[PDB]
Amino acid sequence: KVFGRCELAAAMKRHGLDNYRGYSLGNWVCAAKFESNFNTQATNRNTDGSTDYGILQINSRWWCNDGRTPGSRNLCNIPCSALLSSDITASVNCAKKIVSDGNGMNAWVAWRNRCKGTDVQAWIRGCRL
Ligand SMILES: [Cl-]
Ligand SMILES: [Cl-]
Ligand SMILES: [Cl-]
Ligand SMILES: [Cl-]
Ligand SMILES: [Cl-]
Ligand SMILES: [Cl-]
Ligand SMILES: [Cl-]
Ligand SMILES: [Cl-]
Ligand code: NA
């Protein structure tokens, strides 16, 4: 599923991501925009052979099991395929664990390079929330 901007803002908020670990809703929408372009089915291979899955491009190196990432963990206790669902529950639950791991949203390199410090509220501008 390819979410609209406000549609995703609403789903993230409904699933309790808004201000989770002190990160306003705009941060999470901005991250999803640059990680996946709001596409739940997005997958991208890393140079190290791990893969990033879903709206927030959760990495198989630590967080989910895809069966082809030697040496990795599955700290979210899910198949990476669960992270591609039209329903964002698995992605949100797993993102809450990631953002709690110590480095906040810096875990998402695209968030650090493209969202951090910017006017992230623009991402939820005009949304009925
Ligand atoms: Cl957009
Ligand atoms: Cl915001
Ligand atoms: Cl694996
Ligand atoms: Cl393969
Ligand atoms: Cl594990
Ligand atoms: Cl699995
Ligand atoms: Cl959803
Ligand atoms: Cl933080
Ligand atoms: Na893994």
UniProtKB/Swiss-Prot annotation:
Disulfide bonds join 6-127, 30-115, 64-80, 76-94. It comes from the Eukaryota. It comes from Gallus gallus. It catalyses: Hydrolysis of (1->4)-beta-linkages between N-acetylmuramic acid and N-acetyl-D-glucosamine residues in a peptidoglycan and between N-acetyl-D-glucosamine residues in chitodextrins. The keyword Signal applies. It is an enzyme of class 3 (hydrolase). The gene is LYZ. It is found in: Secreted. The active site is at residues 35, 52. Keywords: Allergen, Antimicrobial, Bacteriolytic enzyme, Disulfide bond, Glycosidase, Hydrolase, Secreted, Signal. CDD domains: LYZ_C. GO terms for molecular function: beta-N-acetylglucosaminidase activity; identical protein binding; lysozyme activity. In the egg white and polymorphonuclear leukocytes. Substrate binds at residue 101. GO terms for biological process: cell wall macromolecule catabolic process; defense response to bacterium; defense response to Gram-negative bacterium; defense response to Gram-positive bacterium; killing of cells of another organism. The lineage of its organism: Eukaryota, Metazoa, Chordata, Craniata, Vertebrata. The keyword Disulfide bond applies. GO terms for cellular component: cytoplasm; endoplasmic reticulum; extracellular space. SUPFAM superfamilies: Lysozyme-like. InterPro entries: Glyco_hydro_22, Glyco_hydro_22_CS, Glyco_hydro_22_lys, Lysozyme-like_dom_sf. It holds the Pfam family Lys. This is Lysozyme C. Monomer. Its EC number is 3.2.1.17. Lysozymes have primarily a bacteriolytic function; those in tissues and body fluids are associated with the monocyte-macrophage system and enhance the activity of immunoagents. Has bacteriolytic activity against M.luteus.
